[PDB]
Amino acid sequence: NKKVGVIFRLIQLVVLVYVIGWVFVYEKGYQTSSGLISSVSVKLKGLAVTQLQGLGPQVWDVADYVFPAHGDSSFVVMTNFIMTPQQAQGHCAENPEGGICQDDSGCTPGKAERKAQGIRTGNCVPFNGTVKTCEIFGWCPVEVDDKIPSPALLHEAENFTLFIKNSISFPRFKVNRRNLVEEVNGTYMKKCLYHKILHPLCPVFSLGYVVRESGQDFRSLAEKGGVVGITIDWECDLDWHVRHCKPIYQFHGLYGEKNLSPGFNFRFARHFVQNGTNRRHLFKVFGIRFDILVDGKAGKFDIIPTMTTIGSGIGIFGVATVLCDLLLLH
Amino acid sequence: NKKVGVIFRLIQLVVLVYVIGWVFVYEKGYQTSSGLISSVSVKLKGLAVTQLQGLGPQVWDVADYVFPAHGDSSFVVMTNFIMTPQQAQGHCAENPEGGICQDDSGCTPGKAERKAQGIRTGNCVPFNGTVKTCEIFGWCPVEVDDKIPSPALLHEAENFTLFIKNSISFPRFKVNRRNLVEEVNGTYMKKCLYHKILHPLCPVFSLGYVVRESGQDFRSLAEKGGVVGITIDWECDLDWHVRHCKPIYQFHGLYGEKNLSPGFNFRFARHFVQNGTNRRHLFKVFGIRFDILVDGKAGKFDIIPTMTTIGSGIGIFGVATVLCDLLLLH
Amino acid sequence: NKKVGVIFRLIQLVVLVYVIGWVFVYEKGYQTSSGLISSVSVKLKGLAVTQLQGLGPQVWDVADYVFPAHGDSSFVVMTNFIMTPQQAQGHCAENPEGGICQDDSGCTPGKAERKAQGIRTGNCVPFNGTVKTCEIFGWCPVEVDDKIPSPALLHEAENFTLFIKNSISFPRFKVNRRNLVEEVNGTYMKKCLYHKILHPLCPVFSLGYVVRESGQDFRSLAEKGGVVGITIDWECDLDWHVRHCKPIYQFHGLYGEKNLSPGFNFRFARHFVQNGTNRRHLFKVFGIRFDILVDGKAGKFDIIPTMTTIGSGIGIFGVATVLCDLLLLH
Ligand SMILES: Nc1ncnc2c1ncn2[C@@H]1O[C@H](COP(=O)(O)OP(=O)(O)OP(=O)(O)O)[C@@H](O)[C@H]1O
Ligand SMILES: Nc1ncnc2c1ncn2[C@@H]1O[C@H](COP(=O)(O)OP(=O)(O)OP(=O)(O)O)[C@@H](O)[C@H]1O
Ligand SMILES: Nc1ncnc2c1ncn2[C@@H]1O[C@H](COP(=O)(O)OP(=O)(O)OP(=O)(O)O)[C@@H](O)[C@H]1O
Ligand SMILES: *[C@@H]1O[C@H](CO)[C@@H](O)[C@H](O)[C@H]1NC(C)=O
Ligand SMILES: *[C@@H]1O[C@H](CO)[C@@H](O)[C@H](O)[C@H]1NC(C)=O
Ligand SMILES: *[C@@H]1O[C@H](CO)[C@@H](O)[C@H](O)[C@H]1NC(C)=O
Ligand SMILES: *[C@@H]1O[C@H](CO)[C@@H](O)[C@H](O)[C@H]1NC(C)=O
Ligand SMILES: *[C@@H]1O[C@H](CO)[C@@H](O)[C@H](O)[C@H]1NC(C)=O
Ligand SMILES: *[C@@H]1O[C@H](CO)[C@@H](O)[C@H](O)[C@H]1NC(C)=O
Ligand SMILES: *[C@@H]1O[C@H](CO)[C@@H](O)[C@H](O)[C@H]1NC(C)=O
Ligand SMILES: *[C@@H]1O[C@H](CO)[C@@H](O)[C@H](O)[C@H]1NC(C)=O
Ligand SMILES: *[C@@H]1O[C@H](CO)[C@@H](O)[C@H](O)[C@H]1NC(C)=O
Ligand SMILES: [Ca+2]
Ligand SMILES: [Ca+2]
Ligand SMILES: [Ca+2]
Ligand SMILES: [Mg+2]
Ligand SMILES: [Mg+2]
Ligand SMILES: [Mg+2]
């Protein structure tokens, strides 16, 4: 049957087109792929002055709110903190969140099994005028985090500038690339701000813009903490010039339920010696967690992948022809 | 032969069964896979008081034994330390491990090529009553780690509480999930402890339980340090409801031979100014290294993967039928 | 035809040889593969004395130039720094890089939008004898990083010793391995330096040797900063003894163009209290960024991968025979 022959030829044409069109070109089979080695470097430029009630103005610079000062892909930017100054080790009252005692007989000498705040001496001392707490041994100024200021202390950190330095290199092809490209020059970085469409190559990122691109409001993240995920893509083709290789930045919002465990927070201390006595300052920092992940793939022409793809295409064409013959045979 | 025909049918059915079940149901081939972006948040709530000989009691709160206070997937929990207080720079004796001198002629001015402890002045000073060491320019109180206390100083860190907050999101499906599943509530986290069977969803992990589940003893590990690997896997099917997404916590023991380089240790210093002189406190912290790695995949029904799997199954079926025909013809 | 059959037999033999020769053995199709759980531990040794102009000799031990003292795969080794001591908050002049004012009317009260150094009070004060800068509210001693010393301060860090402790464990096969192997003993670690050919198993890496193996000169990296990428490979076969499993170290140079943002640098501060006044020391550290990434694969004999590879080879052989028959047909 002439019609049957035409159908067989048509099937052959479709599969032949598919192997050259998709496997060879869309999937870039003629090229080999390998991994890269990336190093993330971050730098902040911003200053926020927070005036605490009953205390002098406090100046914070890049070294203050950037706790990973050495440089890492995962860093926290301080936006709100609770300061407990002049802490000293001694016998004093604990926080009321642990327990409330009405007499000395209720207190038990020892340490709490869960959420321990210190070594209980065994006496009930008044925490304030109304309630009384157990007497413990340790830092007497307790971190009273029951009251969180609604206005963010470091609210100026919204429209600051963030610089990300990423250098990637493919060991198979021995090609090294950096986030700074030929289009980006010295004068450009002096005034550019990163944008999704306008300035995709500007390495100066705005914290508020980064938070808004992920889908989160900066006010709540500055108040109670947050997590922002940043991803850098390096998919490119090595057949063209290295100028075409440009990184693509994507921002993802990592958030959960607001009722249980809202935001991100931690604690750190600064130990010092004043008047011959060891003292420290404890801070409950509510900062935004920034995570940077780099992943990319590069392809360059090679003969062995091309031959393997040609063989696979010939095999698929043969299998398709045999299946078409079996179907036409019925 | 009727029997030969039956054999052909039997092979044909079994290959069809394999494509129908293993390829689909088991492998979720009709479902696409994509990576996730994860951010690890850790918080400790424990207190240990160490009372060394010759010094007052020292209280170590969360800000003390957690050196990565900012928060990272890789953190060290202090369990044992060697304190060398009131260090000041000057010309004084070195450690006996560097070298032993019997006269001033044996000492050579300069710096040691390997394991240098300071700049030698060229004089031999007595380290103690018996032996003499080279005079170097550096911190006079030399950390002598020859004696390691068998009882762990921060031995209370065994049954403390560790909270791990992990937020994962898939960019392909735009679905965000957190380790705090809907089954876990606020009252549940107040008194729950993680267990493989009892409480698999409780985000509160006990350090001693984590060490026991890794095939290690907490005492011998904390005596000299160690490394514990924690892996969180997110294997869920997006075809069902989002409540089915439940993280899996697995603990792996990363240990080596104890005869060569036992445990894990490091050194850090706290710089301060006392009486107009710059001093510091050096600690050789023997702590357990905790590494948290998150890796998971998601699967949702899609048309293109389903069509590709159907085509591959049809091709495999045709190839199997042709091979059976060729074998039966011989 | 005889020659046609001879050519056919030859081709079928060649494909059969290929499947057993390459897919089965070269590719180790029979074995199953899985990932590992790695944990990098680093420890530095060495001392550098930087005698600054008009200041006493400063001793820098391991805890000083190693900012990630707790231990991490990504760490920075200090090689050059700019010290700005005795910083205190107050009203004073700013850096000339922010702006130059000739009168008090030019200054505007508030904070700079980009590269902010403090809160301007609206007054123009002379920074030095020649030029005048805006008056800000913050740390009065400004980090004047216009002059970078050409000789590296911590130039002794070139030929120091770096020890890397890596423990990997395959969860599928329950096999734990460490960078220390049976060939490496206690006496060997006392005196050895890592080499590409001589000492591939010595865990003591020289910083200068690591920098030179990556293709970068250590002098420029100590002067203005640099990034060095280290990779550890754990490809091995579990069919043999565990002694054959040996790590392979590869060093990669991560660098960019020298005109725009050359090297790596950061800033950190050490807070202290002297004479009842809060002070700090700011340092602009020019250090080399070391990134350690571990990846490996282990294979062990299994029956299911062997059967799948045999089936795939039989299918490929059948497809090749069918294609040969079709070619011989016409
Ligand atoms: N977070 C940031 N915001 C704005 N500009 C930045 C930021 N980080 C770096 N830059 C600019 O990029 C240029 C090149 O970066 P480089 O690593 O040389 O910084 P630097 O000059 O060492 O730092 P500094 O400008 O504080 O002296 C610098 O002129 C710097 O001003
Ligand atoms: N290591 C831990 N052990 C036990 N419980 C913890 C731990 N970390 C956090 N939690 C509890 O989980 C709940 C949610 O965590 P969240 O991040 O809100 O801490 P928080 O309430 O801000 O800290 P705090 O309880 O010190 O005020 C809190 O009630 C907290 O007490
Ligand atoms: N950077 C380094 N260069 C050379 N040798 C090192 C280095 N770090 C550690 N080592 C050696 O490796 C051996 C085992 O390491 P381990 O973790 O036991 O150190 P340690 O003995 O606790 O510390 P230290 O050697 O400072 O007393 C030690 O004998 C140590 O001297
Ligand atoms: C005392 O502290 C408790 C702690 O919860 C608080 O409820 C109470 O209002 C405090 N009383 C005064 C007078 O501050
Ligand atoms: C937003 O950016 C502008 C810069 O034009 C700045 O003046 C302003 O303070 C920023 N907003 C906040 C809340 O910091
Ligand atoms: C600086 O870079 C920008 C990139 O947007 C480019 O448009 C501009 O021409 C560059 N300047 C010079 C002087 O090359
Ligand atoms: C002196 O120090 C050396 C150092 O190893 C030690 O062996 C010796 O016992 C010490 N002597 C006394 C009396 O402490
Ligand atoms: C074990 O946990 C209990 C809590 O029930 C605690 O009292 C005890 O101190 C813990 N053990 C150690 C060695 O800390
Ligand atoms: C709290 O969570 C637990 C999970 O084990 C659940 O059994 C319990 O019902 C929850 N409590 C409430 C009040 O929902
Ligand atoms: C004053 O500071 C400016 C800042 O750039 C500098 O150019 C100038 O040389 C300085 N003058 C003196 C006398 O140091
Ligand atoms: C190179 O190593 C030698 C050790 O033999 C050391 O003396 C020398 O100071 C090192 N060079 C530098 C520049 O530190
Ligand atoms: C120490 O290890 C080295 C490895 O190069 C080996 O040659 C030497 O024999 C070992 N020493 C002892 C005492 O086994
Ligand atoms: Ca750190
Ligand atoms: Ca001090
Ligand atoms: Ca890290
Ligand atoms: Mg609280
Ligand atoms: Mg020692
Ligand atoms: Mg500058």
Short mmCIF file of C-alpha atoms in Angstrom, two decimals, chain C:
data_model
loop_
_atom_site.label_atom_id
_atom_site.label_comp_id
_atom_site.label_asym_id
_atom_site.label_seq_id
_atom_site.Cartn_x
_atom_site.Cartn_y
_atom_site.Cartn_z
CA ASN C 1 26.96 -14.45 0.99
CA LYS C 2 30.01 -15.46 3.03
CA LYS C 3 31.64 -12.03 3.32
CA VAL C 4 28.34 -10.49 4.45
CA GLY C 5 28.02 -13.06 7.23
CA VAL C 6 31.66 -12.56 8.22
CA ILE C 7 31.16 -8.79 8.48
CA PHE C 8 27.95 -9.31 10.46
CA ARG C 9 29.59 -11.66 12.94
CA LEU C 10 32.39 -9.16 13.44
CA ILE C 11 30.07 -6.25 14.21
CA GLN C 12 28.00 -8.23 16.70
CA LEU C 13 31.20 -9.31 18.44
CA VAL C 14 32.36 -5.70 18.66
CA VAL C 15 29.14 -4.49 20.31
CA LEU C 16 29.19 -7.43 22.72
CA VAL C 17 32.78 -6.59 23.56
CA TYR C 18 31.80 -2.98 24.11
CA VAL C 19 29.04 -3.70 26.59
CA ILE C 20 31.17 -6.02 28.73
CA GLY C 21 34.33 -3.97 28.25
CA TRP C 22 33.02 -0.49 28.89
CA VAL C 23 29.61 -0.39 30.51
CA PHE C 24 30.27 -3.41 32.69
CA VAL C 25 33.87 -2.83 33.73
CA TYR C 26 35.05 0.68 32.91
CA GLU C 27 31.82 2.21 34.16
CA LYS C 28 31.46 -0.31 36.99
CA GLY C 29 27.82 -0.89 36.12
CA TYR C 30 27.64 -3.90 38.43
CA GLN C 31 28.38 -1.79 41.53
CA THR C 32 25.99 0.52 43.37
CA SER C 33 26.94 4.08 44.31
CA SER C 34 25.93 6.44 47.11
CA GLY C 35 26.94 9.70 48.76
CA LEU C 36 29.00 10.45 51.85
CA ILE C 37 28.76 12.72 54.89
CA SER C 38 31.87 14.89 55.17
CA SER C 39 33.16 17.19 57.92
CA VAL C 40 36.24 19.38 57.47
CA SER C 41 38.44 20.26 60.46
CA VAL C 42 41.36 22.67 60.09
CA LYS C 43 44.10 23.75 62.49
CA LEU C 44 46.82 26.32 61.86
CA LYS C 45 50.27 26.61 63.43
CA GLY C 46 52.70 29.51 63.27
CA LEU C 47 53.41 32.95 64.68
CA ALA C 48 54.08 36.33 63.05
CA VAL C 49 55.31 39.50 64.76
CA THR C 50 54.23 42.75 63.07
CA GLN C 51 56.16 45.72 64.50
CA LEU C 52 54.16 48.76 63.43
CA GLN C 53 55.57 52.28 63.27
CA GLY C 54 55.31 53.97 66.66
CA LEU C 55 53.91 50.84 68.30
CA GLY C 56 55.26 47.84 70.16
CA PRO C 57 55.65 44.41 68.58
CA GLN C 58 52.32 42.62 68.14
CA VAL C 59 52.27 38.84 68.60
CA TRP C 60 49.77 37.00 66.39
CA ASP C 61 49.27 33.34 67.32
CA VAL C 62 46.93 30.78 65.73
CA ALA C 63 43.85 32.19 67.47
CA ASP C 64 44.56 35.64 66.00
CA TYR C 65 44.80 35.14 62.23
CA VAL C 66 42.23 32.31 62.28
CA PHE C 67 38.92 34.15 62.64
CA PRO C 68 36.76 30.99 62.33
CA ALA C 69 38.30 29.67 65.54
CA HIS C 70 35.51 27.12 66.05
CA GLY C 71 36.45 25.42 62.78
CA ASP C 72 34.79 25.45 59.36
CA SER C 73 35.46 24.45 55.77
CA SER C 74 35.60 28.14 54.78
CA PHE C 75 38.22 30.07 56.76
CA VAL C 76 40.35 33.17 56.25
CA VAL C 77 44.04 33.43 57.18
CA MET C 78 45.13 36.97 58.00
CA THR C 79 48.13 38.19 56.01
CA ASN C 80 47.84 42.00 56.08
CA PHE C 81 45.78 44.41 58.16
CA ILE C 82 45.25 48.12 58.81
CA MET C 83 44.88 48.99 62.50
CA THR C 84 42.77 51.90 63.74
CA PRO C 85 43.11 51.86 67.54
CA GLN C 86 41.28 53.59 70.39
CA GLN C 87 37.99 54.17 68.58
CA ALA C 88 35.34 56.03 70.57
CA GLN C 89 31.97 57.56 69.74
CA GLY C 90 31.73 61.32 69.46
CA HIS C 91 31.57 64.37 67.21
CA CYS C 92 34.48 64.47 64.76
CA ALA C 93 35.41 64.52 61.08
CA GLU C 94 34.65 61.85 58.48
CA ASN C 95 36.75 60.21 55.78
CA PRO C 96 37.50 62.31 52.67
CA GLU C 97 36.09 59.55 50.44
CA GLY C 98 32.56 60.49 51.50
CA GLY C 99 32.84 64.16 50.58
CA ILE C 100 34.81 67.41 50.88
CA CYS C 101 33.22 70.60 52.23
CA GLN C 102 34.52 74.16 52.00
CA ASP C 103 31.96 75.77 54.34
CA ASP C 104 29.31 74.88 56.90
CA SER C 105 26.49 75.63 54.43
CA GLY C 106 27.59 72.76 52.18
CA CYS C 107 27.05 70.15 54.89
CA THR C 108 23.54 68.76 55.30
CA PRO C 109 22.30 67.21 58.58
CA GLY C 110 21.32 63.57 58.23
CA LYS C 111 22.86 60.36 56.92
CA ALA C 112 24.44 59.66 53.54
CA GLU C 113 22.36 57.56 51.16
CA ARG C 114 25.33 55.48 49.96
CA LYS C 115 28.60 54.67 51.75
CA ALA C 116 27.33 56.30 54.93
CA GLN C 117 29.94 56.88 57.64
CA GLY C 118 27.78 58.52 60.31
CA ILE C 119 25.12 61.08 61.16
CA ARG C 120 26.13 64.48 59.79
CA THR C 121 25.65 67.37 62.22
CA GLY C 122 25.62 70.02 59.47
CA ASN C 123 29.07 71.43 60.29
CA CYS C 124 32.26 71.41 58.21
CA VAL C 125 35.36 70.58 60.26
CA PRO C 126 38.93 70.26 58.89
CA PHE C 127 40.00 66.65 58.48
CA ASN C 128 43.63 67.80 58.29
CA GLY C 129 45.63 70.91 57.44
CA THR C 130 44.67 71.03 53.76
CA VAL C 131 41.17 69.63 53.21
CA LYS C 132 37.98 69.64 55.29
CA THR C 133 35.34 66.93 55.65
CA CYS C 134 31.83 66.70 57.07
CA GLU C 135 31.35 66.27 60.81
CA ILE C 136 29.69 62.96 61.73
CA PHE C 137 28.63 61.19 64.93
CA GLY C 138 30.47 57.92 65.48
CA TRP C 139 33.89 56.37 65.95
CA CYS C 140 36.32 59.29 65.71
CA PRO C 141 39.46 57.41 64.53
CA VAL C 142 38.65 56.73 60.88
CA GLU C 143 40.00 53.73 58.99
CA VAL C 144 42.30 55.47 56.50
CA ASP C 145 42.84 52.64 54.00
CA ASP C 146 44.28 54.80 51.21
CA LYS C 147 47.84 53.59 51.91
CA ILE C 148 48.41 49.82 51.81
CA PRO C 149 51.88 48.62 52.86
CA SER C 150 53.60 46.85 49.99
CA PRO C 151 55.55 44.43 52.26
CA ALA C 152 53.10 41.98 53.81
CA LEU C 153 52.83 42.32 57.59
CA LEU C 154 52.19 38.61 58.18
CA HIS C 155 54.56 37.55 55.41
CA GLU C 156 55.73 34.59 57.53
CA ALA C 157 52.39 32.86 56.82
CA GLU C 158 53.74 31.66 53.45
CA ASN C 159 55.63 28.58 54.68
CA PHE C 160 53.48 27.78 57.73
CA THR C 161 51.76 24.43 58.36
CA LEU C 162 48.05 23.69 57.84
CA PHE C 163 46.43 20.43 58.98
CA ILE C 164 43.11 19.35 57.46
CA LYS C 165 41.05 16.66 59.22
CA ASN C 166 38.28 15.21 57.04
CA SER C 167 36.05 12.28 58.03
CA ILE C 168 33.64 10.82 55.47
CA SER C 169 31.10 8.05 56.04
CA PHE C 170 28.86 6.32 53.50
CA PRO C 171 25.44 5.70 55.11
CA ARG C 172 24.40 3.07 52.56
CA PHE C 173 27.41 0.81 53.19
CA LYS C 174 28.05 1.88 56.82
CA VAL C 175 31.76 2.44 56.14
CA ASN C 176 33.60 5.30 57.86
CA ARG C 177 36.85 6.72 56.48
CA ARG C 178 39.17 9.53 57.56
CA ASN C 179 41.85 11.56 55.80
CA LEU C 180 44.41 9.79 58.00
CA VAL C 181 45.16 6.43 56.38
CA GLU C 182 47.10 3.32 57.42
CA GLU C 183 50.17 4.54 55.53
CA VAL C 184 50.21 7.72 57.64
CA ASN C 185 51.40 7.15 61.22
CA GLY C 186 52.15 9.34 64.22
CA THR C 187 55.83 9.82 63.39
CA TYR C 188 54.99 10.68 59.77
CA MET C 189 52.72 13.56 60.81
CA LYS C 190 55.51 14.99 62.98
CA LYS C 191 57.69 15.98 59.99
CA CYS C 192 56.04 16.00 56.57
CA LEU C 193 54.94 18.54 53.96
CA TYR C 194 52.24 17.85 51.39
CA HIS C 195 53.46 17.39 47.82
CA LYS C 196 51.69 16.51 44.58
CA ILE C 197 53.96 13.50 43.93
CA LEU C 198 56.26 13.00 46.93
CA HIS C 199 53.83 13.22 49.88
CA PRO C 200 50.22 12.94 48.65
CA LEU C 201 49.06 11.47 51.97
CA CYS C 202 50.73 13.94 54.35
CA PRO C 203 47.86 15.93 55.95
CA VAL C 204 50.16 18.91 56.62
CA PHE C 205 49.61 21.50 53.87
CA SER C 206 51.88 24.50 53.37
CA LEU C 207 49.96 27.70 52.65
CA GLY C 208 52.49 28.92 50.10
CA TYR C 209 52.54 25.51 48.42
CA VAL C 210 48.72 25.45 48.33
CA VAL C 211 48.64 28.92 46.76
CA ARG C 212 51.32 28.04 44.19
CA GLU C 213 49.61 24.78 43.21
CA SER C 214 46.43 26.72 42.38
CA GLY C 215 48.35 28.98 39.99
CA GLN C 216 48.55 32.17 42.09
CA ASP C 217 51.48 34.08 43.55
CA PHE C 218 51.46 34.31 47.33
CA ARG C 219 52.88 37.84 47.48
CA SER C 220 49.93 39.56 45.79
CA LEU C 221 47.47 37.46 47.79
CA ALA C 222 49.18 38.51 51.02
CA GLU C 223 49.25 42.15 49.92
CA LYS C 224 45.71 42.70 48.63
CA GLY C 225 43.89 39.45 49.41
CA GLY C 226 42.94 36.37 47.42
CA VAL C 227 40.74 33.30 47.20
CA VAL C 228 42.01 29.71 47.03
CA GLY C 229 39.72 26.72 46.45
CA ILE C 230 40.61 23.29 47.81
CA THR C 231 38.80 20.11 46.77
CA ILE C 232 39.06 16.62 48.27
CA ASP C 233 38.09 13.54 46.25
CA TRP C 234 37.08 10.17 47.74
CA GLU C 235 36.50 8.01 44.66
CA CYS C 236 37.28 4.40 45.57
CA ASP C 237 36.12 0.81 45.13
CA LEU C 238 34.67 -1.04 48.12
CA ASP C 239 35.33 -4.43 46.51
CA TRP C 240 38.98 -4.10 47.56
CA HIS C 241 40.25 -3.48 51.08
CA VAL C 242 39.57 -0.17 52.83
CA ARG C 243 43.31 0.59 52.76
CA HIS C 244 43.10 1.41 49.04
CA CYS C 245 40.66 4.23 49.84
CA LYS C 246 42.89 7.32 49.78
CA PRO C 247 41.84 10.97 49.42
CA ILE C 248 43.02 13.02 46.45
CA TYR C 249 43.56 16.75 46.96
CA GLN C 250 43.14 19.27 44.13
CA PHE C 251 43.77 23.01 44.43
CA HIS C 252 41.92 25.54 42.26
CA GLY C 253 42.65 29.24 41.89
CA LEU C 254 39.64 31.52 42.26
CA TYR C 255 40.65 34.97 40.99
CA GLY C 256 39.32 37.80 38.87
CA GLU C 257 40.41 41.00 37.15
CA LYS C 258 42.82 43.15 39.14
CA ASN C 259 41.37 46.52 38.09
CA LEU C 260 37.91 46.13 39.66
CA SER C 261 37.85 44.97 43.31
CA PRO C 262 41.10 42.97 43.49
CA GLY C 263 41.53 40.44 46.26
CA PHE C 264 39.47 39.75 49.37
CA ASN C 265 39.15 41.89 52.50
CA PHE C 266 36.83 42.53 55.43
CA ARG C 267 36.55 44.49 58.67
CA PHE C 268 36.01 43.36 62.26
CA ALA C 269 36.12 45.02 65.68
CA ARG C 270 37.14 43.95 69.19
CA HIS C 271 35.02 45.67 71.84
CA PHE C 272 36.45 46.41 75.29
CA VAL C 273 36.12 48.84 78.20
CA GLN C 274 39.11 50.93 79.29
CA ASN C 275 38.99 53.60 82.01
CA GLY C 276 35.22 53.21 82.16
CA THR C 277 34.82 54.17 78.48
CA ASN C 278 33.71 51.83 75.71
CA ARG C 279 36.47 51.52 73.10
CA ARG C 280 37.34 49.19 70.23
CA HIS C 281 39.99 48.39 67.63
CA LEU C 282 39.04 48.24 63.95
CA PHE C 283 41.08 46.13 61.52
CA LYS C 284 40.86 45.91 57.72
CA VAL C 285 42.14 42.35 57.27
CA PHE C 286 43.53 41.37 53.86
CA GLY C 287 43.40 37.59 54.08
CA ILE C 288 43.28 34.62 51.73
CA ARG C 289 39.91 32.87 51.51
CA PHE C 290 40.23 29.08 51.70
CA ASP C 291 37.21 27.03 50.58
CA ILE C 292 37.26 23.26 51.15
CA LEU C 293 34.72 21.10 49.30
CA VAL C 294 34.55 17.31 49.68
CA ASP C 295 32.89 14.94 47.21
CA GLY C 296 33.36 11.22 46.64
CA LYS C 297 31.77 8.01 45.42
CA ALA C 298 32.12 4.39 46.53
CA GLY C 299 31.03 1.26 44.66
CA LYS C 300 30.31 -2.20 46.03
CA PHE C 301 29.14 -5.34 44.25
CA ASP C 302 25.38 -5.88 44.11
CA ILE C 303 23.03 -8.18 42.23
CA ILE C 304 20.30 -5.74 41.11
CA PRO C 305 22.66 -3.29 39.33
CA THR C 306 24.42 -6.26 37.73
CA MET C 307 21.13 -7.64 36.42
CA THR C 308 20.03 -4.22 35.14
CA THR C 309 23.35 -3.72 33.34
CA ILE C 310 23.13 -7.21 31.82
CA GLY C 311 19.60 -6.49 30.60
CA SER C 312 20.64 -3.15 29.13
CA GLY C 313 23.60 -4.78 27.38
CA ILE C 314 21.38 -7.52 25.95
CA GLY C 315 18.93 -4.88 24.72
CA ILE C 316 21.69 -2.84 23.08
CA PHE C 317 23.08 -6.00 21.47
CA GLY C 318 19.65 -6.88 20.10
CA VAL C 319 19.11 -3.36 18.75
CA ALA C 320 22.54 -3.47 17.10
CA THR C 321 21.80 -6.84 15.49
CA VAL C 322 18.44 -5.58 14.21
CA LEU C 323 20.09 -2.46 12.78
CA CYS C 324 22.75 -4.61 11.09
CA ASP C 325 20.02 -6.80 9.59
CA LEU C 326 18.15 -3.73 8.33
CA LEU C 327 21.34 -2.34 6.79
CA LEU C 328 22.09 -5.68 5.11
CA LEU C 329 18.53 -5.77 3.76
CA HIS C 330 19.17 -2.62 1.71
#
